[PDB]
Amino acid sequence: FRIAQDVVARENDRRASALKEDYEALGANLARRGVDIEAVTAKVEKFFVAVPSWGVGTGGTRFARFPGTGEPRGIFDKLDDCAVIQQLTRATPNVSLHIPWDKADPKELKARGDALGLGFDAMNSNTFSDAPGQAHSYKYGSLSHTNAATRAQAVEHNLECIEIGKAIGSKALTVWIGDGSNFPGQSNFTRAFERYLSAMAEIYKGLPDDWKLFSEHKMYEPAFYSTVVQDWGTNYLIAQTLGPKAQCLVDLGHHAPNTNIEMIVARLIQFGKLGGFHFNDSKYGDDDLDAGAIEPYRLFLVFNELVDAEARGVKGFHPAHMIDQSHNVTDPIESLINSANEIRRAYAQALLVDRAALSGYQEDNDALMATETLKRAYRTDVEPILAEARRRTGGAVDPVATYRASGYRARVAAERP
């Protein structure tokens, strides 16, 4: 236990009475609306989202990085910190690894995970930066590089990520590359894409049949003119071309300004290529801010489509859920705690939508009541449900408050001078 159980129990008891009052009131309110709060809490406590090992430490920009105290010094420290997030929120039992940043004896990683009560989500390859001893540079690309030997090297790296994953229980490989161009003419759009598809086909050939391959589109950065996998349209072509095991991953901050992302989510679901999500929030570009901190309604609307798919009869629908954020000016652990909470919040609210009523308003083209139907769910303060779900599962009623009362940050600051 990263956080002393006595502290968790102490901070829960301190807020137990108020929570009971809020939960009961909400329970009565939902009962008046024909909803059993218990049924919602039950689903909420089972909603999980993977935390990024690379978000456990303070992030930075091309201009600077401002580390705080007790910065994790490696993957093992990072797992220790991730365990705090899980213990308190109970919403992040799995960690997403990134190779080579997190390279270490896989057996030891799995060992530290089991001890901490953490599992591992999809693996993440890295051919957007050069590692020491690398024969070919990814300066001008990786999986779509003009040099055959460079593409082969990139493929081998991804195959190595799969091997690592198999040793720790991972069942998927996420591939995001910076491949693209900064100048018109620098790259031939079609040939670069053909090269990418050929290299991804090789990775697919080496992909275990009990694994999935997620390709992640991004409009720009690091490439500032064109990017090979620029949007969901190219991403769909990729997944469809590679095979059933290949699906698309949607990072919320990777779209052009004003994009209707919830529609992209719906389209991918309809054609069975929605592999999963990379949650975060943003205002300008791929800001990688705490989920729901800028546009909480958009987050709700994305979950509205996920829940709608279930309501529509889509069977065995279980897209992968992962947080992909950068914490530049806050305690990384606190931001991850509240981000996971925010994701559960949007999910909970989506579960409250009166699907029958919404359906009737859509068929009758009553736009005002249709949108109001979504708002009645979104406006509902589900915090009592999120807190109770945590309390009932070993977490904290108020995670950040408990985290600070524990003095964990000061603790690791002393341990990690």
User: Under the criterion CB under 8 A, does residue 285 sit at the interface with its own copies?
Assistant: yes
Report the nearest approach of Zn ion to the CB of residue 266 (Å): 20
Is residue 290 annotated as involved in ligand binding? no
310: Cβ–Cβ under 8 A, 6 or more apart, which residues?
A: 317
Nearer Cβ to Zn ion, position 145 or 278?
A: 278
Q: Is 36 annotated as a binding residue?
A: no
Beta carbons within 8 Å of 267's beta carbon, 6+ residues apart:
232
Return the closest-CA partner of residue 383 out of 344, 352, 353.
344
Q: Which range touches its own copies (CB under 8 A), out of 3-11, 96-104, 107-115, 283-291?
A: 283-291
* E strand intervals along 92-244: 94-98, 119-124, 172-175, 180-181, 212-216, 226-227
Give the C-alpha separation, 321 to 121, whole Å: 9
Give the count of alpha carbons within 13 A of 307, CB side only.
24
H or E element, residue 359: helix 355-363
* 71 forms part of the interface with its own copies (CB under 8 A): no
Residue 263 contacts its own copies per CB under 8 A: yes
C-alpha separations of 213 from 62, 125, 239 in Å: 30, 11, 9
Going along 316-414, which residue ranges are E strands?
320-323
Tell me the window of 80-88, 101-109, 113-121, 280-288 that interacts with its own copies (CB under 8 A): 280-288
Among 80, 305, 324, 388, binds its own copies (CB under 8 A): 305
Q: Cα–chain-centroid distance for residue 55? A: 11
Residues 171-200, one symbol each (x = binds its own copies by CB under 8 A, - = not), give -------x--xxxxxxxxxxx-xx------
Binding to its own copies (CB under 8 A): which residues in 328-367? 328-331, 334-335, 338, 358-359, 361-365, 367
Q: Which does 127 bind (CB under 5 to 8 A by kind): Zn ion, its own copies, none?
A: none
The token pair at 162 is 């799969």
Nearer to its own copies, 371 or 393 (CB): 371
**286, 251 Cβ separation under 8 angstroms:** yes
Q: How many residues bind its own copies, per CB under 8 A?
A: 115
Which one of 66, 107, 115, 117 is in contact with its own copies (CB under 8 A)? 66
Q: Which does 140 bind (CB under 5 to 8 A by kind): its own copies, Zn ion, none?
A: its own copies
Within 10 angstroms of residue 408's Cβ, the number of other Cβ atoms is 22
At residue 392, what is the residue type? R
- Residue with smaller CB distance to its own copies, 28 or 111: 28
Choose between 286 and 388: whose C-beta lies nearer to Zn ion: 286
Residue 45 interacting partner from Zn ion, its own copies, none (CB closer than 5 to 8 Å by kind): none
CA dist 187 and 226 (Å) reads: 8
Nearer to Zn ion, 121 or 324 (CB): 324
Tell me which stretch binds its own copies (CB under 8 A): 38-46, 80-88, 113-121, 267-275: 267-275
What span, in angstroms and rounded, lies between the C-alpha atoms of 136 and 140? 10
Q: In the complex, what is the shortest distance from the CB of residue 133 to its own copies, in angstroms, rounded to a whole number?
A: 9
Choices 106-114, 198-206, 315-323, 369-377 (CB under 8 A): range interacting with its own copies: 369-377
Residue selected from 34, 209, 257, 417 as contacting its own copies according to rule CB under 8 A = 257
> 115 or 256: whose CB is closer to its own copies?
256
What is the Cα 399 distance to its own chain's centre? 19
Pick the closest to residue 199 from 134, 135, 155 (CA basis). Answer: 155
Q: Which is nearer to Zn ion, 286 or 334 (CB)?
A: 286
HEC string of 176-195 equals CCCCEECCCCCCCHHHHHHH
Partner from its own copies, Zn ion, none contacting 198, C-beta within 5 to 8 A by type: none
Cβ closest to Zn ion, residue 245 vs residue 278: 278
2 or 255: whose CB is closer to its own copies?
255
Instruction: State the binding partner of 313 from Zn ion, its own copies, none, CB within 5 to 8 A by kind.
Output: none
Choose from Zn ion, its own copies, none: what does 301 bind? Cβ within 5-8 Å by kind: its own copies
> Which residues, in sequence order, are CB contacts of 25 under 8 Å at separation 6+?
384
Could you tell me if 153 and 202 are in contact, meaning their C-beta atoms sit under 8 angstroms apart? no
Binding-site sequence positions for Zn(2+): 216, 251, 254, 278, 286, 288, 324
Binding-site sequence positions for Mn(2+): 216, 251, 254, 278, 286, 288, 295, 324
